[PDB]
Amino acid sequence: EVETFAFQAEIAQLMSLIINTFYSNKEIFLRELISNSSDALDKIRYESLTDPSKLDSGKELHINLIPNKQDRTLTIVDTGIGMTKADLINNLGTIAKSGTKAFMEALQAGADISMIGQFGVGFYSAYLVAEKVTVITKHNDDEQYAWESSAGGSFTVRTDTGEPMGRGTKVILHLKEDQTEYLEERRIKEIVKKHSQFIGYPITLFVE
Numbered sequence: 383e384v385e386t387f388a389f390q391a392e393i394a395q396l397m398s399l400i401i402n403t404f405y406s407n408k409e410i411f412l413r414e415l416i417s418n419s420s421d422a423l424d425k426i427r428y429e430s431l432t433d434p435s436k437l438d439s440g441k442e443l444h445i446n447l448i449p450n451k452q453d454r455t456l457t458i459v460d461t462g463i464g465m466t467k468a469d470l471i472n473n474l475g476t477i478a479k480s481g482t483k484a485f486m487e488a489l490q491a492g493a494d495i496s497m498i499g500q501f502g503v504g505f506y507s508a509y510l511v512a513e514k515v516t517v518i519t520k521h522n523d524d525e526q527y528a529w530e531s532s533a534g535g536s537f538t539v540r541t542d543t544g545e546p547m548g549r550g551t552k553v554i555l556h557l558k559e560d561q562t563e564y565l566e567e568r569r570i571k572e573i574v575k576k577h578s579q580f581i582g583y584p585i586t587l588f589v590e
């Protein structure tokens with residue numbers, strides 16, 4: 383059922399730095415994840431241009447933002463290309479190793495955490511607001527998996543069942559207890575307006 387993996391050392395160190403470096407501009411996590419989602423949607427679109435059957439598992443290309451005050455969760459769902467088990471495990475499809483170095487080198491020379499996305503590792507900016515991240519993904523080529531990590535150097539992957547998605551990725555952010563501003567409709571609206579207002583795909587902010 384549950385496999386447990388070690389992050390490579392460079393990723394564990396990055397994560398450790400994201401969780402530990404004093405940095406109040408936490409709101410950028412949302413832009414980085416919406417922008418990962420948009421990238422994932424570009425990919426399935428581009429692929430469906432010459433094989434229209436890949437849109438068989440869902441034709442709308444969109445992004446949903448779902449807050450839940452009770453679970454203390456913010457979920458970013460896209461119907462993008464999804465990941466296979468191999469992608470998930472290879473740093474969620476990322477070049478996280480050479481990226482984390484390129485990035486940590488950009489810090490050294492006067493970059494700040496907000497540029498993380500420039501090096502292909504914007505994903506880990508979720509750990510600015512989340513104590514645990516869960517990623518549920520389904521790629522046409524594979525079944526549905528759950529990836530999960532509360533940092534500490536390891537992640538798990540299991541196959542996921544019960545709420546099939548069809549195609550795409552859900553990043554479920556289990557928020558730190560002082561970061562519940564990001565469950566607020568006004569707050570989420572403002573951030574999207576401010577950081578993602580020209581995204582190629584509809585974004586729908588769910589109501590509670």
Ligand SMILES: CCOc1ccc(-c2c(C#N)c(N)nc3sc(C(N)=O)c(N)c23)cc1
Pocket residue numbers: 414415418419422425460462463464465469473474475476477478502503504505506551552553
């Ligand atoms: C180390 C962080 O780098 C990441 C981590 C996750 C994503 C990602 C995210 C994110 N975040 C996402 N929502 N979907 C996908 S699909 C995909 C692929 N087909 O390979 C991804 N890589 C991906 C993108 C970059």
